[PDB]
Amino acid sequence: MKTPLTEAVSAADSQGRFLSTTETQVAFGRFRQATSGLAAAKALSEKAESLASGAANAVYSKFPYTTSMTGANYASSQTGKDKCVRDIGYYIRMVTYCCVVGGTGPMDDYLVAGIAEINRTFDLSPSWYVEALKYVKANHGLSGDSAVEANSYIDYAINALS
Amino acid sequence: MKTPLTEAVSAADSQGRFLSTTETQVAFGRFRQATSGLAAAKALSEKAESLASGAANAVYSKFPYTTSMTGANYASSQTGKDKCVRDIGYYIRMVTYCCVVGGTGPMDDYLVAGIAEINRTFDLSPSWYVEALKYVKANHGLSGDSAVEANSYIDYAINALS
Amino acid sequence: MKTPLTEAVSAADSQGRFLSTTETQVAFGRFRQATSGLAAAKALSEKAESLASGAANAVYSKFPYTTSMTGANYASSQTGKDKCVRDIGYYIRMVTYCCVVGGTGPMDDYLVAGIAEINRTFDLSPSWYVEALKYVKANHGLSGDSAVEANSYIDYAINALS
Amino acid sequence: MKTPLTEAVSAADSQGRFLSTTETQVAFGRFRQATSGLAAAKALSEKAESLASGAANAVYSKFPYTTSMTGANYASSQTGKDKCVRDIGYYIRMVTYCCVVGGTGPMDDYLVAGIAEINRTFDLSPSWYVEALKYVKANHGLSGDSAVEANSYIDYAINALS
Amino acid sequence: MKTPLTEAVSAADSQGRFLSTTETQVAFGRFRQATSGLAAAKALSEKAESLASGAANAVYSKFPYTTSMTGANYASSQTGKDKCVRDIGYYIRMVTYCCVVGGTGPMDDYLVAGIAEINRTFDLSPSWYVEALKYVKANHGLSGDSAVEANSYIDYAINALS
Amino acid sequence: MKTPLTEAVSAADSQGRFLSTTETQVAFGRFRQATSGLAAAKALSEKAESLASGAANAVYSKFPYTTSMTGANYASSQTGKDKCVRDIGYYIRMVTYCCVVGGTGPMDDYLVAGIAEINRTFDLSPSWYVEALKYVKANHGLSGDSAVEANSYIDYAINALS
Amino acid sequence: MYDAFAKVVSQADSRGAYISASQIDALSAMVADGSKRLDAVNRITSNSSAIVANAARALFAEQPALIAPGGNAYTSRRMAACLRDMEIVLRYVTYAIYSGDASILEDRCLNGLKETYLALGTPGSSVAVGIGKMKDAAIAIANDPNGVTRGDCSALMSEIGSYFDKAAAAVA
Amino acid sequence: MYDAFAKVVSQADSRGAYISASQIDALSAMVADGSKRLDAVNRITSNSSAIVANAARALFAEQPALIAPGGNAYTSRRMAACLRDMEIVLRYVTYAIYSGDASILEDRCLNGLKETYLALGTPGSSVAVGIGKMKDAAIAIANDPNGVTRGDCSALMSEIGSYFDKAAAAVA
Amino acid sequence: MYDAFAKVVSQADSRGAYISASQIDALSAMVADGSKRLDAVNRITSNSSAIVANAARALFAEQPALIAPGGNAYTSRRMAACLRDMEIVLRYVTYAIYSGDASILEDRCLNGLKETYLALGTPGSSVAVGIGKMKDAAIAIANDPNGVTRGDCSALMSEIGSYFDKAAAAVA
Amino acid sequence: MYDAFAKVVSQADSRGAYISASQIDALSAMVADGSKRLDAVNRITSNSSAIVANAARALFAEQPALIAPGGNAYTSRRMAACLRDMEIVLRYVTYAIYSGDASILEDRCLNGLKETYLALGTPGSSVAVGIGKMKDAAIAIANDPNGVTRGDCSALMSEIGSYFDKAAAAVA
Amino acid sequence: MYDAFAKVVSQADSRGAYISASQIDALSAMVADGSKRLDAVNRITSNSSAIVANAARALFAEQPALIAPGGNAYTSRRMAACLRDMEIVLRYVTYAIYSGDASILEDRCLNGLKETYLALGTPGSSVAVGIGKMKDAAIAIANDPNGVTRGDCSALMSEIGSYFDKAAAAVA
Amino acid sequence: MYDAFAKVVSQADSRGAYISASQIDALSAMVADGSKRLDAVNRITSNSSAIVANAARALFAEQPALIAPGGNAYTSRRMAACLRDMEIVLRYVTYAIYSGDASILEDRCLNGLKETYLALGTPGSSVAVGIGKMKDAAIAIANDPNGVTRGDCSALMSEIGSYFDKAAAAVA
């Protein structure tokens, strides 16, 4: 999967080149980000359960029809509510993974590639998920570089959905 | 030209992607490196004339026949001596450029690509230049990250010649 | 644009071949269909305005929130309602074109290719349009081959949206 | 092999598409054609021996040297005559197969592809076979669409030979 | 155009290499052959008119229907006879060219490439020309290497027709 | 391996053609030259021992540092002198092979391809070998066409090193 | 591939035989049911998206392990590939219905599928279950007497079911 | 490419309009005489090799310079090419007749052809003459009252002539 | 392409010159504002979908003729291509901001673009309007004082503005 | 590939050996018979089409099952492929004769051929028979005493025979 | 490929798990030693040509059979391939050191390498010996206390050795 | 390409003529000078590296602006390309000498070279000077009276010069 380190390697490999100070800079940039990145992953994982259920309720509030309209695509049943909270938890977990590797790789590999097909087939609205992601961004309680980084991946998912 | 920044941009462009925190990291690495990189360039530039002359003398001493044997490829004539210190200055200058951009790019584009053809055609020995490069490394007077970086480019050249 | 005739020609052309009885059969099949197809195109054209407005109303009844929620993507403004009725009119008009040429070609070229991008960017739900399409199917008043053919294109569009 | 049905499927498959009203028309055209197509195949097979013998004699009559000149390529021996009626029987049988599938496919796959190499290698003249084929046309006693179709495949073979 | 010398050059050029003693040997062979080849070209040319008309007559004898049958493809009319002697003259002229350059190149470039198409389209039998070529071989009066080479080109044409 | 004969065959093969008088001329050239070439190969293998030894000494005379300077790439040791004489023997043996096949083939396959990588990695000077090769040319004691052919292979190697 | 007509011809040629009056009658039968056949193709096709979605939903509900983290259908890319496979099989099945022959389905879809799934670790038995759910839904829609001239499509339905069964057996 | 139906649709879409009841009647007309159109395509196609051969013969008889040594149609390679071009134009004309629109011919055959000829030194004026000969023969074959249900094909022959005239005018 | 550093090196090498102390100071200065630059890139990128959609929406509102049937933005395929162009321009602009040089934007995006639009019949001036709208939106988002360490990004905003203007100017 | 000269060299190199005065004598002997070798090549090549045609005719006369419907040589495509194979083998054999080494024949013609025929169901023993007929005809033409300077080519015909036999053994 | 961070994430996702506070500490330790890792990469890389040449020289000295006429390393082409392989393995080993994972080495360098050598007749065991000589030279260079801030790189040197050993074991 | 014999044939065929007297007996004359022609090719070829290096050295000595920073021959990649072109022109000239016709040189080397240099900013004028220097060296080497049977090679040297002059003219 793509990370700043594997990208640096792939670029060198494709040219048949040993690493140079170019890739050293990539690594020093990576190592600079890692501390706050790993801190973001830690804190998000501790708030994950609460964030996911809190975000789900924020979606229900903005799109109140999703808890009353009949259909397997809706959270008008307990099954649907549980699916929804599960999905939001997936987005959060992916964000932590991106913080751990320093890039969108994990989010891409596990969630974004194919997401459009899923939402089309199961009649789920991208807007629902955008509102969930916005709530997470408002309520993660991170600050500094940890927040800037976490938000970059949250906003990347939002861009993917819109 | 290849630099940590153009390489980041090129990687994203090939994938049709906006830049992300991955490329942010690359830039932070670049900016962390640039202070001492630029310092190395300035200090080398100031010592360039002296390093080049001193390096050519180190080569003459290591390979005495080079100032003895007749031939357009040798430094037995004034013209030959001038070509030699000119060539050594080119290497030093390319090293400064590599320090300015944070990569081997300038060295590759201007000096290394085709160097084998040149040495073969004009009957110049790579080992003469390796000796010159060793002298520059032992005499530039740099310390810390400045020296590590400048030396990485010098050693890069030595590798390409051996 | 794809039609049964252009596809037959395209297949022959790519093989560098003159047309044969294979292509004659294609055209006989086309000419058998074309009369009921043009009848459907004409019937739809006469009812287009009524069907579009009725379809829009059916959407609002299914999804009342599209007339109350604030946002340029909704029909909670006259401008928004006009956009919606326009859009449904487009679909209806594409169906008549399909009936005129005997295939999905026109719908593909003018509407389906790129629709997913439009719906993503402008935050419109495919489900709104599926409901509108079901209304036109239930109200166009066609029968015999005219209905069968018209419905195949309407259902093709529903398939594209789900 | 090619038929109007397999060509419709192939076109759709190459595009990753489900079948649509386009291919439905192809099939109706096929089914419209098949009744007279099958009748042709039936009548021809019943008159095949008489037609092949009659056509061979038509050839010998148009080109008398074919029964006089010695050489394995000619019909001056019994073996040669037998080869010749056999070949014409092949042509007739292929025409029936085309009538069965509604296209040139069988004649292409079994007879026309490579026919050039055979005639060159064994020194057989295409004009002999063109004359045979003209006899078949003038004598199959077909009428209506059955004739138009069978004649199309015969004329197709003539074209391939000329 | 193919000749020993252009083939030698082509081979060297495709490998980006200067000529070597390999191509020197090619040229020596060509040069030793040329004397006998140019002599064949001269002698054939001097007998060209006699050979073409004699050859034509030979074809009429072997295939008498060729001067009796009505048809634009036959030599029943003076017009047809004139076409026939012209064609045969073309074959002889190409043979002289092959002798001039020491290869089949002229005959390939000017006559063999596309000959199948011509004979098919105009209903001309390869066998007629094979017989003409057999006459030329038996009547050119050439001896030694001149005959062996000239015959090599005549047989090359015969092979291409059969 | 490239030789006049295999290259004649290779050309014919890639065009899917039978051999013709063109390739006969190539083989006639080969067979004429082969007497001289084989003679050159026999004579060289008899002088090889003392030619290799004499050529090494010529290199040491032209390049005195080669026996005084310390290092594995030099002949300042017995092991170095032995490597050097061996190498030169390799060149001479390849030249005999070239005379045997009538081309640079053996010399390319076994020595020239990769020689640049060898000289770079082991820090051997191409000029050393050009000097050895000149010695071989001036002292092999061949005359006439034998010498002209052997010299062309020797000069081929010189060109490759310069 | 072959359609029904071409299949007969290819078996005849290898015998140097004319198509029998018998085989002609069997092809004449297919032609007589031609409109029913196209109604079936149109109907199944016009419901392709729902057939796939409904069959997939049911499958994942019965086999939750498929979608739990670590499961074959877990992650968006794998879910999408799974849904794609379902749509693919449905598509090739309709080609077979249209052409009156299974060659298209066997040649371009089923050939090597089992071994592909083996190598990926995709559970073929589960795919077979998804395929059977599509089969029942497809026949249900195809054979609905509403909205079509009334008549017996029983032989067609049995043929349709055989193509679905072949697909399922290929991966089961 | 467009066929006649698609051409009308594209003109309608650019104005956001349903096809005019008038436009519908004109397309319905082509449909009405479809069997005639297909007879014309079948007959022309069925005589393609003869049409090319006879037209080329006639051209060379009228213009001996083309086949004299040094002539553009001299040598087997160039003659074969010349015959090929004639067959290509005839084939694309039949595509235009079948589809009831000239776009296939213009786009895949005529576009760039004059420029190709000028660059090669092929005399387009001669190609135009050969095309006219193919035209006269094609219409003669297509419009022959023998062996077909009798009726009027005059409007169709006029359309057919228009395509051939299009091709000739493009290189003349 | 060049970034800011490479640009200065290429200009020096053509003169056989060492980079001057003063050129080094200029590079040191951009380096000193590096994190500001990176915040700008991140902010604009993080809003790419909204910047495109909002600018397009306002463009179409201002020029309804673009979306009227027969307009260049009418039909889904043309609309999608139009949105894609808007996003492409934005993307290449952010590459320019990131690298501190216009070369990437010039070489891979703007070069030959005005000509492409002219050929297609796409109104270049309309694209320029859309780009200007993206500029204002992007700069407003990049220069937002909330949620960032307080400081002066005025030189950076001018540089950013210059890249958008260059794009706008290339197709106007 | 190797010719006779190259074969000797490749065997010497791996031993770091100079070619022996004895091996040179051998090669010298081959050169001596070189013109005889080239006559044989010219003569066989000059009759290539007849050699293939006549051998093919004899094969099918002896094994009618090959050309009966369903036979491997039945149908124009398969007949054409068979004739082609005959021509291919003859061609590669002449290559071996010309270069004085079987490597070209082994590497580019025979290697894998048995397996190919097995996959196809092509009867290799029948191919062997066709190859032997070509052999008989080739040696008869190459060894005709008429119209050549009289001499002994017995050793050459044996070598020629060995290349045909190597080919026949490879497919049998 | 994976780096150390990606490896952990991939293992977690298959369990649907957040990365543990424990796994985090482990990644923190790697980051803490990051500068040491980059010095090692730099130092080994900056000596790549000498490490290859010296290791090769010592190999051929210990095993004269490799370069003797007939040996696998004899002839310029084979010697060059041999030197290339030494440099390739070193290069992939440095990629592994850099990314902190062996996947890049396993996937793009070592996979199928034993099989490759076996089929060529290249002595794997000799390659392994060469790799081991490179390993010893590389660690001596990387762990030279001269010219670097003094600290403990023993863990890193152990890890570096493990990559070289993985390479050696894959072909031995 | 043509060699001298082929050029004559093509001129003859365009007139439908057998080989003329002025063309025949003449060609015999070129054949009679064949060994001298091959001496020239061998001598020039055998000194190709030196001819390129010496001519390049003299060109740069005469025109120092070419190798000063900013010159077209400055930097290793440009120097290397420059030496390559010189080698290429010399190579193609030798093909012309060998084949006795300029077509190889014109078709594969010179055609569009002037235009290429104008696009790159390469000074054609300077290339012509280098080619002139190779010409002089090549002719001196080819026409060296030592080590060869003496005779008149003046016509040949004149032909050789004309090929060099054509090449210089094409770029000047």
Ligand SMILES: *[C@@H](C)[C@H]1/C(=C/c2[nH]c(/C=C3N=C(/C=C4\NC(=O)C(CC)=C4C)C(C)=C\3CCC(=O)O)c(CCC(=O)O)c2C)NC(=O)[C@@H]1C
């Ligand atoms: C055994 C195959 C038959 C045979 C051969 C034979 N040939 C020669 C002599 C020559 N053969 C050639 C061949 C060619 N000359 C050409 O110009 C061409 C193509 C244009 C070919 C293929 C030549 C030039 C000669 C020398 C002159 C001559 O014609 O004699 C001999 C004589 C001995 C020798 O090696 O020269 C023999 C024996 N002879 C037979 O009896 C076998 C039937």
